[PDB]
């Protein structure tokens, strides 16, 4: 059939010319049923038509077509645990989005994709349905109805074939959990394939670190209950016999550094095989080769196992590689943070030979900064250069501001409130400004802090702080006096050894003392300052302005920040009033904490804590009584009431402010007082020496599945505080408070773990060596006051 005209009907978006080009047939040619069929098939293959009804009139070839409807809107219903925006992004990534044509063939595909996503999440009964609503002008709206079920939670994790280690012990280190006590935080009971792979690898490492070279995981099974509300995980393993390490052999193109590597591959003949040690040796070899310029020093270990004598001979293959030089280091995604902020965290120098370890260290430092949600690296090659690369870092910035609130309770400070707003990255400059405030029974504190982490390119930081502090002594178990003080303080920080950190600075503090109960020590100090108050009223007042030079040194080596098992932390703090200040004194403090594990697993530890302090005046004056040292409580000597160790106040006779019988008053004239009098109110001392020896043991009764999250210890605390300026000769009848021989000792048991309410620490101690006036307090606890 000859065609004189080709016409189209129903076209909406596809151009007539484009469709005509698409058709094999063209106007002015013979045409047959086969040609009609081919044209229809091609038109449908275009992918923009739902039905094609190519037709022939008497002379004209009429074509009726129905284009795929355009999506007008997308709606969701029932996506309780999946956000609407998350569903929208998933769908556009799949391909379906507003404004495009609704392919009536992919409804099932989309539904199955969503169901697969839900199954990955953990909801195995989730059902997804799509409702399509036609609209005028060839428009269609799709509605996705969701039937999310109940998430499936692990009911048991079992290991079959383990004879040397209990299944609970093995699961203790797993990410997946089958028991979640309400009184502890260990994680959720959800299942994920990534978690399963991770904890399988963790089990493999656990077994390989004990010498089980032939360890093997036969297979793993994941099962569901018929209701699909629970998951059972089984792992079958074949643990072999323990193997010794006969020796280490190194071969390959070491690049003339053989002598230096044999020193890195030295072991005691007859040592238990250890995969962690093997990996450390490989990393050390890689670090050496990198230090000598090579960028990709591949290292492999292929142990040879001899079952006759149970010995392992390591075969290490080392290939130095080539040297690559970094031409540029680029940062992309730092819309807010400036370039220098990201660049100063780099251990890899631009224009120098490449190092994979250095690049990884830079990435880790960028992650530690905390300003970015994600950090990625890409070592792009330079076209036309076989040994030059460009390192590119892609960072997704994250919000840094944070409101904060906190509530805690304890025996010492009672109810503690905290509140503050922080900004770790001020306008992408690296400055960390913030205002904080705390309040407890005896003190309310509020400070405004500004710090520059990099005052010098090396890493020196310049601080800054304005603070206001109100201190109520009587609420702190001391002699009655109120001290409302405010001041400023700027300090520097010098990192010197990656563990040690010096710091020096200046400061100005104004102290306004009022509501002071007359007593020997306070009046001695006041006389030393030239004041001549009266020992008759509690309405005294006193103000001073002091400029101090504060210095300190902090050594930190603890392996872990929480429940450390090895290392030592030493902190030294100082202070001295520079001339021109009302006060003239120096103060020194020293805190120590040493952990000495006594087993390979680091489950039995010995903790030794000591605290020291001393201070005195310079120009014939006394150290301020509000700078004294206090001992006793849950932090210095457990079993004693907080701030109870040390000298006790000796009040003079004085009429009370507002006398009212039925209330205990301290040695007042209205009760028949005509001479000085001893009391039991702590005042502290200018010298302090506290020591503690604590033995840490595993929790005996808690299930071994999560017994590592609770720390049990038996302690023996010692302490003493004395006043070096006390004049024993004048006050002969009263106890001599200048004698340091009065050592207070206590012992007991303490518990400590993390709870949803916050960190918990409980302690029961029985002070078996106390002196007159000391108030004992056996049970002590602190819930969340560490925030």
């Amino acid at each position: 059939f000859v065609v004189k005209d080709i016409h189209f009907e129903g076209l909406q978006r596809v151009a007539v010319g484009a469709a005509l080009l698409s058709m094999p047939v063209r106007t002015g040619d013979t045409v047959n049923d086969e040609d009609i069929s081919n044209t229809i098939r091609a038109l449908f293959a275009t992918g923009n038509f739902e039905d094609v009804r190519v037709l022939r009139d008497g002379d004209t070839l009429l074509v009726q077509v129905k284009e795929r409807p355009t999506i007008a809107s997308i709606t969701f219903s029932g996506n309780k645990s999946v956000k609407d925006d998350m569903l929208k992004q998933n769908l556009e990534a799949s391909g379906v989005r507003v404004g495009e044509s609704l392919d009536r063939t992919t409804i099932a595909d989309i539904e199955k994709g969503l169901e697969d996503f839900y199954y990955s999440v953990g909801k195995y009964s989730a059902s997804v349905k799509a409702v399509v609503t036609p609209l005028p002008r060839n428009r269609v709206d799709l509605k996705l109805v969701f039937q999310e079920g109940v998430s499936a939670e692990i009911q048991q994790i079992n290991i079959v074939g383990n004879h040397a280690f209990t299944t609970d012990e093995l699961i203790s280190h797993f990410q997946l959990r089958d028991e979640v006590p309400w009184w502890n935080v260990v994680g959720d009971r959800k299942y994920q394939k990534q978690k399963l792979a991770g904890d399988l690898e963790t089990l493999r490492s656990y077994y390989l670190d004990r010498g089980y070279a032939r360890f093997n995981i036969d297979s793993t099974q994941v099962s569901l209950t018929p209701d699909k509300k629970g998951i059972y995980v089984t792992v079958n393993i074949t643990e072999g016999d323990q193997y010794k390490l006969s020796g280490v052999e190194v071969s390959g193109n070491l690049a003339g550094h053989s002598a230096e590597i044999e020193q890195l591959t030295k072991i005691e003949p007859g040592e238990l095989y250890n995969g962690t040690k093997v990996t450390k040796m490989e990393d050390d070899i890689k670090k050496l080769l990198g230090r000598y310029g090579y960028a990709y020093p591949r290292v492999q270990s292929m142990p040879e196992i001899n079952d006759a004598d149970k010995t392992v001979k390591l075969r290490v293959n080392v290939d130095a590689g080539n040297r690559f030089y970094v031409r540029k280091i680029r940062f992309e995604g730092n819309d807010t943070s400036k370039d220098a902020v990201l660049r100063r965290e780099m251990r890899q120098m631009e224009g120098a030979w490449l190092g994979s370890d250095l690049v990884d260290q830079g990435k880790e430092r960028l992650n530690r900064l905390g300003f970015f949600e994600t950090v990625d690296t890409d070592t792009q090659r330079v076209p036309g250069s076989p040994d030059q690369v460009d390192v590119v870092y892609k960072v997704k910035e994250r919000n840094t501001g944070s409101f904060n609130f906190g509530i805690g309770y304890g025996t010492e400070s009672g109810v503690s409130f905290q509140a503050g707003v922080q900004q770790d990255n001020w306008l992408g400059t690296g400055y960390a400004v913030g205002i904080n405030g705390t309040k407890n029974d005896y003190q309310t504190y509020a400070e405004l802090s500004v710090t520059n982490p990099y005052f010098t390119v090396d890493g020196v930081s310049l601080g800054g702080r304005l603070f206001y502090n109100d201190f109520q002594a009587d609420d702190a178990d001391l002699s009655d006096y109120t001290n409302k003080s405010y001041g400023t303080d700027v300090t520097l920080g010098f990192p010197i050894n990656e563990y040690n950190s010096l710091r020096a600075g200046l400061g100005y503090v104004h102290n306004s003392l009022s509501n002071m109960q007359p007593q020997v020590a306070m009046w001695r100090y006041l006389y030393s300052m030239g004041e001549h108050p009266s020992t008759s009223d509690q309405d005294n007042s006193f103000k001073t302005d002091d400029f101090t030079f504060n210095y300190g040194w902090t050594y930190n080596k603890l392996d872990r920040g929480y429940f450390p098992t090895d290392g030592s932390r030493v902190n030294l703090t100082g202070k001295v009033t520079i001339p021109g200040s009302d006060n003239e004194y120096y103060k020194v403090t020293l805190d120590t904490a040493t952990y000495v594990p006594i087993d390979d697993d680091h489950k039995w530890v010995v903790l030794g804590r000591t605290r020291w302090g001393y201070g005195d005046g310079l120009g014939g004056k006394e150290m301020p009584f509000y700078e004294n040292f206090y001992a006793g409580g849950s932090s210095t000597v457990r079993g004693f009431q907080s701030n109870t160790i040390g000298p006790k106040a000796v009040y003079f006779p004085h009429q009370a402010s507002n006398y009212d019988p039925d209330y205990d008053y301290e040695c007042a004239t209205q009760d028949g007082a005509k001479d000085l009098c001893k009391s039991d109110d702590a005042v502290g001392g200018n010298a302090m020496a506290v020591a503690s020896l604590e033995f840490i043991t595993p929790t005996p009764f808690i299930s071994d599945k999560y017994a590592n999250s609770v720390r049990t210890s038996f302690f023996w605390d010692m302490g003493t505080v004395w006043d070096t300026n006390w004049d024993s000769s004048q006050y002969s009848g009263y106890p001599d408070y200048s004698d340091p021989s009065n050592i207070r000792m206590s012992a007991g048991i303490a518990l400590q773990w993390m709870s949803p309410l916050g960190p918990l620490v409980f302690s029961y101690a029985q002070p078996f060596k106390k002196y007159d006036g000391d108030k004992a307090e056996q049970f002590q606890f602190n819930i969340g006051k560490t925030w």
Partner: peptide, 7 residues
């Protein structure tokens, strides 16, 4: 307890 919300 300590709540921390990011602004």
């Amino acid at each position: 307890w300590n709540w921390s919300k990011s602004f």
